[PDB]
Design a protein around this nucleic acid. Sequence first.
DNA 1: GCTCTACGGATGC
DNA 2: GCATCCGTAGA
Length: 641
Amino acid sequence: SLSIIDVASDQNLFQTFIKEWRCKKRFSISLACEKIRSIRDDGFPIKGCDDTLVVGLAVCWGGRDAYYFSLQKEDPSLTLKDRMWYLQSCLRKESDKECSVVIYDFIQSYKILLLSCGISLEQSYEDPKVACWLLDPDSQEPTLHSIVTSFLPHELPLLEGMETSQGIQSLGLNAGSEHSGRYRASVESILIFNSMNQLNSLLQKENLQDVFRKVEMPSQYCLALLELNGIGFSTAECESQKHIMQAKLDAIETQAYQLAGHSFSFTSSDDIAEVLFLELKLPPNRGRQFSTSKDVLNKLKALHPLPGLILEWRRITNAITKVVFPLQREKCLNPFLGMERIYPVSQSHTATGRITFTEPNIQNVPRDFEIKMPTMPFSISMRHAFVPFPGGSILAADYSQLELRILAHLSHDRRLIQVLNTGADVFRSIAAEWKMIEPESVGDDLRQQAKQICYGIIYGMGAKSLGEQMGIKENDAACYIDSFKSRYTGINQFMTETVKNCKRDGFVQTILGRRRYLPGIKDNNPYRKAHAERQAINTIVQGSAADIVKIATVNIQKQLETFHSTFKSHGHREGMFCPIRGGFFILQLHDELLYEVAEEDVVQVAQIVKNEMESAVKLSVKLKVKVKIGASWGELKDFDV
DNA sequence: GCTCTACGGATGC
DNA sequence: GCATCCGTAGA
Ligand SMILES: Nc1nc2c(ncn2[C@H]2C[C@H](O)[C@@H](COP(=O)(O)OP(=O)(O)OP(=O)(O)O)O2)c(=O)[nH]1
Ligand SMILES: [Mg+2]
């Protein structure tokens, strides 16, 4: 049954444990976290919540043995200094010592080990959660109990009465359900080592271990570093943007109240519909009798401008309560950098394979949009609020149209490869063809509309929605659909091949092999089947783009680790002088790698990032990037050097 | 009958 | 009233 060995009680036992740890090439370390129970005696205070504390580690290199490395200050021969030195030495990789450390919730445990314990993990990582996601990307978030049930059933009764292993977070890190951190961490290590061995066998069966250990887990390490750095924030810039946005919101509200007389509430869809359709003419679209989406008011723009006022009000409100308040709320402070950063929580459990940041979402920050504030547009830019550290600069690296290049790779579209290799900007060409204007005289918003039209046609947009977005008839939209499909015959061939392969195999394989299972391809409902086909087409391209982005991130992290000898992260600086000099991955936009590169190495790291992103996994189409240097995320001036 | 994600407000059996 | 649904934003 349970077998926990206190390696911090006897000197000879400690030395034997250290020797066995050094001899072994695969660990299962885990973190024991309890309540304060009240500081500096019970253990290291974990950064963030002040009600939790770390007590020690639990290592299990096979079997039920759960050697517990106690970090408690209460064997006098083993002081904190020598114990921590041994822990760091055994957790440091050197002289080609292959060691696969297995850690549940690797990102959070890495952050805890660095920020509180001051221990820099440098070995390989084998997060069981990441392997579980790799097996079933579109499945729900893998709880500890879920992995134990689905991969290690025989060890299930060891979790008897352990209901704390249900809230996503590992039982080792939470402090509820009693179960003092010793037993919790030890049993957690026992569970995760064997479940990760089973996960490795399954990965070998599915031929997914190479991607798991070469790109997926190194990208998880890069995301951990991202979480320790965190995207920048300026506070004052966001305050100014909020003040201007609120002033414009008040002006719009007063103008609308003057126009319509009464004080109808914008937030109420029923009130808006009543004041628009059944009271002030404004014939409806094709209570809640009439739809009141953004598209409806956008269509009703040639009429009197109240729908435009409501659209501006809605956009400003969405920017002010969904993007401004969350940033001002979940905003931290970094005393070492002297500036107010904000650390998002990364999540790689997305369906296609992208990385999305929660609490808050830095990716869904609306870009620069002009506002009509009479006094010419103020061009409200709250991405301006994401300033880097003083003496640094954002070094964003956005791929030239990435799903297009990956499409041309996996289509054998001679036309598309020819167009993309010799830069022609397919989206600008589409805008020029649609609007009959010259390709050199197309605005940014027209370019974005053309890009969303092209991607829609790629991903099976219907004629009705195509005509609705493009402002043309159903027949004209269908004719445009056939014109686009015939122009790129390889794209259509790839679409049919994708649908056939997803129907035959039940899943779709990414460029490296991170298969996504789509049983809906066998659905009988026509809408569900069509959605499954479209999401399979989008998976093999979008997940491939995210996987290429992860490879580029891994390569850039490697190159900025060998070069620019310094701490690998701001959290590394906090745990363990001189000006800042490094890359410091801060944010990802599913095709764009924002880096908090210092001013001294702006050119060098810019060249390194561009080279490692272009020289990443190569296709029949050259992968182009547009490195943009900015004093913030707003003024990203082009950087072709 | 474009995809992926988050996320706050609106309904809701 | 948890529990989604829906509509907004980014890619
Ligand atoms: N289905 C769908 N996918 C999109 C859409 N926009 C972007 N994607 C994907 C394509 C790329 O993998 C990724 C990059 O989005 P961007 O806004 O940066 O456009 P893109 O990089 O393709 O071109 P650009 O940066 O303007 O030169 O997002 C869209 O409107 N629909
Ligand atoms: Mg791009």
